[PDB]
Design a protein around this nucleic acid. Structure first.
Lengths: 420, 15
DNA sequence: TTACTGTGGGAAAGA
DNA sequence: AATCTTTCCCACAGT
């Protein structure tokens, strides 16, 4: 029998912020299969179960009577939705797992799609169905020049990419750029998401740099920063690859699934190359009859692909619930109205429902639903956080949380700060 | 638009 | 040590 | 005209 969240329960949650997070890490595009072929999604989508809440829930379930088998979360992956072919992910003893065998056939007429993650515990108690960000179906990558008109295939400076290498048309040889143990390596099992930043040509080397806006073009100076570790490679010039060559005179916009070359800016034709698991510096041999072409190593060719991440955070504030936790509301940003009648806060995001309430700390706010991507609420008086405060004395920072009618808490990682 | 602070991992040569 | 099957990449044909 | 989309097939490694 469902229950509303109480200030005591809210207070208790805020004491130990034990949330259960689901991350779906994937590519923004996908190449389609045809004649019974299975052109697997590369890089493989990855489901990570993050947060202190997973252990807290394993503990809760096991004390109630569940075995380790029963308390173990289960995940299944698929596309939205086909004829229900869902692959089991194995997270047994792992905080994450990759979807190594996913593909999309010509039979699917959808121009776009989302991955769906069905989740439940061993005992079959539901968690819910988590959606990836929008994925664009692609016939194959553009062999000739690209236009900014279809920017859905272009690479915007400041967005994230995956970079992989494959030898002799073999799925077995697939190694991905990735940082672990303080180093950049080429993993056959993990993959990194690197921000690709555009720098002006005049820009100097070093730890600090100025990023520029716009679409990435061959010949431009880029900077690749791992979105987890925070490590970068030295300045690189992204270059087109014809076959075993690197074209210098090319200045076309860099597109999805194209083969690239990373010339280490200010070096004697040195490129970012792979040798087994190692990331090295390999020197290109220049073409005898062409000043605009350099022969590069087979491990110096990298397929570039735009990546995205879906993040869902929930907590059983009033204990286990009947209804799934999904669709988990996501808050993109907060804004004041301001600055009109009374202080209003505007929430921009997705998966908002009429049955959600905004909370500032342990204080519930008058909440007004607008649509699934917009919500309005009234900022409570400062006196609701500090007894008898006739005005805001000194700054107070309070968490903004979305709470559901049945007790589920969805934290935002956003706060509201009162100032005089 | 914007500044980024990211330590540089130098890829090495061989021999 | 083979023949059978299957990703993946390139080029060719068709929309 | 030049593009994308579908088909086709070989290479090279699992069964």
């Amino acid at each position: 029998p469902p229950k509303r969240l109480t200030r005591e329960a809210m207070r208790n949650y805020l004491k130990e912020r034990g949330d259960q997070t689901v991350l779906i890490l994937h590519a923004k595009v996908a190449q389609k299969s045809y004649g019974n072929e299975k052109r697997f999604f590369c890089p493989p989508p990855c489901v990570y179960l993050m947060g202190s809440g997973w252990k807290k829930k394993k503990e809760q379930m096991e004390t109630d009577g569940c075995s380790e088998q029963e308390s173990q979360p289960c995940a299944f992956i698929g596309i939205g939705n086909s004829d229900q072919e869902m692959q089991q992910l194995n997270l047994e003893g792992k905080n994450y797992c990759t979807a190594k065998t996913l593909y999309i056939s010509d039979s699917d007429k959808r121009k776009h799609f989302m991955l769906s993650v069905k989740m439940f515990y061993g005992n079959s108690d539901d968690i819910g169905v988590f959606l990836s960000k929008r994925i664009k179906v692609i016939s194959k990558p553009s062999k000739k020049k690209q236009s900014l008109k279809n920017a859905d295939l272009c690479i915007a400076s400041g967005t994230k990419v995956a970079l992989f290498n494959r030898l002799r048309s073999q799925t077995v040889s697939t190694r991905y750029l990735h940082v672990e143990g303080g180093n950049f390596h080429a993993s056959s099992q993990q993959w990194g998401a690197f921000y690709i930043h555009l720098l002006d040509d005049d820009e100097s080397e070093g730890e600090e740099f100025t990023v520029r806006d716009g679409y990435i073009h061959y010949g431009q100076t880029v900077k690749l920063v791992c979105s987890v570790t925070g490590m970068a490679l030295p300045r690189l010039i992204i270059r087109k690859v014809d076959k075993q060559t690197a074209l210098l005179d090319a200045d076309d916009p860099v597109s999805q699934l194209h083969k690239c070359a990373f010339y280490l800016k200010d070096t004697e034709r040195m490129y970012l190359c792979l040798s087994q698991e190692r990331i090295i510096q390999f020197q290109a041999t220049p073409c005898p009859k062409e000043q605009n072409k350099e022969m590069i190593n087979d491990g110096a060719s990298w397929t570039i692909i735009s990546t995205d991440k879906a993040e869902y955070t929930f907590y059983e504030g009033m204990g286990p619930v009947l209804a799934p936790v999904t669709p988990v509301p996501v808050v993109e940003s907060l804004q004041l109205n301001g600055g009109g009648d009374v202080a209003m806060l505007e929430l921009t995001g997705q998966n908002f429902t009429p049955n959600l309430r905004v909370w500032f700390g342990d204080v519930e706010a008058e909440t007004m639903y607008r649509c699934g991507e917009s919500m309005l609420c009234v900022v409570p008086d400062i006196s609701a956080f500090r007894e008898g405060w006739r005005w805001v004395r000194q700054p107070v920072q309070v968490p903004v949380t979305l709470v559901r009618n049945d007790g589920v808490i969805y934290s935002t990682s956003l706060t509201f700060t009162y100032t005089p | 638009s914007g500044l980024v602070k990211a330590p540089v991992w130098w890829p090495m040569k061989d021999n």
